Amino acid sequence: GAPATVTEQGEDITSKKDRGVLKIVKRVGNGEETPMIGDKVYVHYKGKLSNGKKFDSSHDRNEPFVFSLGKGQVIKAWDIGVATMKKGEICHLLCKPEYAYGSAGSLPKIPSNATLFFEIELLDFKGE
Ligand SMILES: COc1ccc(CC[C@H]2OC(=O)[C@@H]3CCCCN3C(=O)[C@@H](C3CCCCC3)NC(=O)C3(CC3)NC(=O)COc3cccc2c3)cc1OC
């Protein structure tokens, strides 16, 4: 499935070039602008452990998820990955533990040393 395809063929979007954050565009977005550090960004998403059977269903998929880009409000993989998205884009993102919850995890749902997989839809962003 998509997690395996992204693992094998995804673009490495990390500064270290450690394949720690891998991306494949699912739906091409609009324009060329991407969100900038400090912007408020608004997304829809689905996430899971990369080997999991189903996407987690413990948020309202209709409500935007909002955060300030590049401020460490979300896991590193999202700060890196959302920065690369155009408005309207949907991507797949595969996140190795160092760019997610690392050795501590977030128990019980996220074990220690967990690789994560997301589908992210960028709705909007603004610099206000
Ligand atoms: C700077 O590093 C961090 C900053 C914040 C956190 C707290 C968790 C943070 O969640 C995430 O960053 C990511 C990506 C944004 C959507 C949610 N998320 C998750 O990992 C998922 C997760 C669920 C289980 C399968 C794997 C993905 N979390 C969720 O979807 C839920 C259940 C609903 N939890 C939350 O969204 C809790 O609220 C927030 C709100 C902001 C940041 C994070 C969590 C953890 C961090 O490092 C470990």
Q: Which atom of ligand 1 is nearest to the CA of 116?
A: 26
Alpha carbon of 73 to ligand 1 centroid (Å) = 9
Element (H, E) at 40: strand 40-49
Phi, psi angle pair for 90, to nearest 5°: -115, 130
Order of strands across the sheet that contains 65-68: 11-12, 21-27, 90-95, 116-126, 40-49, 65-68
Q: Coil, strand, or helix at residue 5?
A: helix
Question: Are residues 73 and 98 in contact, defined by beta-carbon separation less than 8 angstroms?
Answer: no
d(CA 16, CA 69): 19
How much of the chain is helix, strand and coil, in % rounded to 5?
15, 35, 50
Residue 59 CB–ligand 1 contact under 6 Å: yes
Report the distance separating Cα 39 and Cα 58, nearest Å.
Answer: 26
Q: Name the experimental technique.
A: X-ray
Rounded to the nearest angstrom, the distance between the alpha carbon of 80 and the centre of ligand 1 is 15
* Residues with active-site annotation: 45, 55-56, 75, 101, 118
